[PDB]
Nucleic acid binder design. Sequence first.
RNA 1: AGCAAAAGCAGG
Lengths: 51, 511, 67, 611
Amino acid sequence: IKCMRTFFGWKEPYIVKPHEKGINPNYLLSWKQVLAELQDIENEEKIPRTK
Amino acid sequence: EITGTMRRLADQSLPPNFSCLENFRAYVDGFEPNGYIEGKLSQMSKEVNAKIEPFLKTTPRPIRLPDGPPCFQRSKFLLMDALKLSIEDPSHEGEGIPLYDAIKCMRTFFGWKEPYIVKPHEKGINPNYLLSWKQVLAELQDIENEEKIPRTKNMKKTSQLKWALGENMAPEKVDFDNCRDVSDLKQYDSDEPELRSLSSWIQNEFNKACELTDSTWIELDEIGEDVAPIEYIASMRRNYFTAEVSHCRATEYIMKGVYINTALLNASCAAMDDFQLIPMISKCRTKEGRRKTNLYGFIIKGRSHLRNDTDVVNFVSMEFSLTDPRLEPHKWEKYCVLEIGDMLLRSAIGQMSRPMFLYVRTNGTSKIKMKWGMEMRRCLLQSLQQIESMIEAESSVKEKDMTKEFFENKSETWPIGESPKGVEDGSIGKVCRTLLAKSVFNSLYASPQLEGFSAESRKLLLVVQALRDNLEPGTFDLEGLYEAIEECLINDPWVLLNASWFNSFLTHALR
Amino acid sequence: KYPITADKRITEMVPERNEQGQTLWSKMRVMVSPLAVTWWNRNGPMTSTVHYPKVYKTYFEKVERLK
Amino acid sequence: MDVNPTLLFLKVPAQNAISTTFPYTGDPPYSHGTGTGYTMDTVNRTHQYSEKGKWTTNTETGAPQLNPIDGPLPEDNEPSGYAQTDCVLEAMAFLEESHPGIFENSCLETMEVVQQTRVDRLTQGRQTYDWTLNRNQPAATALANTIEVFRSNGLTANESGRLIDFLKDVMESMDKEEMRVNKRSYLIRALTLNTMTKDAERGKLKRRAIATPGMQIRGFVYFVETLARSICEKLEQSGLPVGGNEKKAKLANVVRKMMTNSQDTELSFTITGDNTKWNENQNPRMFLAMITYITKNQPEWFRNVLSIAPIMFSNKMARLGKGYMFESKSMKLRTQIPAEMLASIDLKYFNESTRKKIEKIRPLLIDGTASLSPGMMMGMFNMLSTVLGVSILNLGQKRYTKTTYWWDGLQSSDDFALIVNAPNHEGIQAGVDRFYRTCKLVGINMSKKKSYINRTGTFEFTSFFYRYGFVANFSMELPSFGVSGINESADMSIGVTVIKNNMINNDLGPATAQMALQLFIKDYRYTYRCHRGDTQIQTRRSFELKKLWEQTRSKAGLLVSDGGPNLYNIRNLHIPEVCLKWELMDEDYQGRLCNPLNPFVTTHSWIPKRN
RNA sequence: AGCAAAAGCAGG
């Protein structure tokens, strides 16, 4: 988290490669869930060791 | 719309000679002066008259300091003997909830012997404070090793801490009728406290506290550019000032106090029912490295419900210490010193391996004193205000208007030191440091004794300047000043030392 | 968090989370975060109108006296 | 080696380095305990000061009231508030003879203001005493309280909107025998004045116990103080209403006017000091007499509506406070004892000093609240007392002292600074003893302990210390230099405006004011987390700041609360911030800023959620 | 026990 916090340069997520199978938007929203979960846990909870 | 009843009250309000409002008004409106004042004066007793006297050179005797037991320290945190377990320069992006930075620094040090008391308190119960410290160490290791990283930790209730804060010590409100039958009751023990005598310890603490520490202890950012003249003069004055001040130990006390009081006020406004652990943590940038979070000492805050700001809050304070007690056992009748083993200091030759003791004293500050210890940056500012006032005075008496005339020149122009059969002179650096530390101790040992002394020493010193410049001063009643000073010198060591300083000033000035 | 208060109208213009995901506004009007402000000032409607110096242009006159 | 700041104070001139004896850089001591003991001691002291004076009970009150005036001449140099009204009247007569037309002009100003005034102004006060809850409360609630109780009363002036009719109808229903409170109890309740121990008294050891009045007398004192402000504005010797650098110059001007020594065959000394017991040894009777003389040849109704203040000064029953809190030693139990029963309790539970105080006051207790009117109320901004005492200084016009020596100077509410001349130390001693006597014959008591005297050139007054030509001042200490706590838009503005006010009025040098702004912006950023864009410090927000900071076109032209730099300095403080940045900003940012689409309206402004 | 003072806290 400290290292991800170090980097700035995050544009909006839009897919660049068509998977051609499966569903690309769903993986986009997965990544979104990741970032949101990480910021939300660390900013405003009692520091869980593993999330 | 007077309604007459006000005319009744009015006619009763007047002097005895006149019994009505209307006769009064007619007398005044029909009044003229007839030189009554001279008849009044000649009529008067000659006893009632203020007779001047020559406030002579040899008249003002040395103010006698009170006598009694030795003066004892009461600061919320010791000042010279404390030490700080560094963090060794962490990164710049990693923020830290302060407990973990502290724990990291306590984790850095090894040299913990078994705890056994070194100073008999002579009151209270020393073993209980020992076991309090034990609870602290155990709680800290236990939380951090095997729990989900709590941001802030509040201790567990025990015999030790609950004794040292007296959650049972409270009596309870009751009505009058149920207790009037009792005869044990008293209004309160509202009386003067025990006298105290000056001693040498506070002087040593001050001397150490004016001295230069090594680090920088304060940064300062940028502001809009400088075009007009007065802007440049302000800029150079403040730059000189902060550069001279930053390497103080006074400024160290400043940031330490500010962080301590902010933490305590955050806690108390945010947490009352819970014994809290807090560090005496302070952020200092190394002169040559990164930001350093120093761990001065742990705190065990006691429960704090502040129905009014004036109310006291009590707690316990642990600040580490190298220098042994029993060299100056008068300085503390209040501490409870433990032994915590050795710390392996490195001198130029060999290794010192001095023991390590801990001063787990108890205390209680306030809400108010916490606020005013938060606002000591104002006190630094006030020292600047004073120096600038001095320089503007010297600019009014001499049109040179030269700040640079004093700020940097190597010129012995300022005495602040008294030596055996000598007086030392220093530069503006030492004096800015000293004025600052004086104001900081004013902020630490603020007490009505100080304010009384300040007014009275102010008036007498003003008279003494009036005397020394041959301005034929006079004073009607002088022993009133002396007794009132002696009234205000009750017990406060800082007050006492300002008084001994006044004394030796009278002597070396010779007025 | 969430010091600032503001209406529900903002909810349409701006998202509930930014690129990092940290939140700008949440319900129990909606509480808004200070980050929400600095998201406006990076991206928002740009308009060259000079109506707001209706009275704020007065202070510029006082600065022309200085410079 | 030992160390001392007293020896830098040895060499250095005292008045320039005087601030070193200004230790107030830390919290004032305050009074943890109920002031009631200090109140009792003050009342004991003033009633001891006038013990020679007879007293007679007031009608319908049951209360002894002492009238010191026409008392004897004092016996000993120990102070005592004994005066003679004739002194006051001849003083005012010499004053008007000196300053012709000043009285009538100030009177006409009082007429036009009372005709134009409105009730809406008084309510913007602080802690006027309400009578319902019997406790000091805010002024808006106070005004609501009185207008509603008046709506219940038969009067209708709260609907009028004017103010003197309001005071008149206050008086009318005040003369009523019932509201649910009988006439005697109601007149004791209206004249009541909370005790309310002094807080922040800097420069003492024990406490003054400032007592404060209620709203109903507040308008009367407002009118008479408006008269006093007018007459003192037309005066040249007042110190209170004159202020700032004009006051600073007035000090220097009077010493100029009197220090010029034509035919200087005479030595000269120039007293300063502090007139002890100012709020005690004075009296409202002299004030009423002054008032009657001041509005000579005027509308009678104005005479009455401006004489009503000193009379209710002339009879007042202030409270004592909370009471005490007794405690058991063995059983360890405590309780508060409201002192309303103090006129019943035995004299054994108490402390001995306390005991003797009680028996001194216990006769002087009616409804439990102490009655007294030989002495002024502690800590009012009267300033008609300055109008009094300045007349003494006016007597030292050589026409009227009618001798070789003569005094003059200025005098604020408690400080005073005479300037005399006489051919020798003996003549100056003669004239100053004459002055001290005179000043006591009017009932003003110059202390002999904490005062002094010197050659011309150096003299204190109101802390505006005046060495030969230098006029250093330490009137009020710097306050806080921290955020106001509202929003990132106006908190900065409020801070800068406060800094500007305290550099323009007081002696905040710019050298400290830049540093003050520096601490202020540090606190601003550390509170709202919003450090510079181009930095390395971390927080919640710093993402968007490091984002926008590259997003821009003009980098330094940014508001500070979003990554911006602070271009303020002592040149450009009155202006706001975005005026200084506006045309240094590009249209994207400026368009995002001033836009009605913002819920913020000024987009940085907002309302925080209550807590 | 302590804080700090010519009176209060040591929770309601």
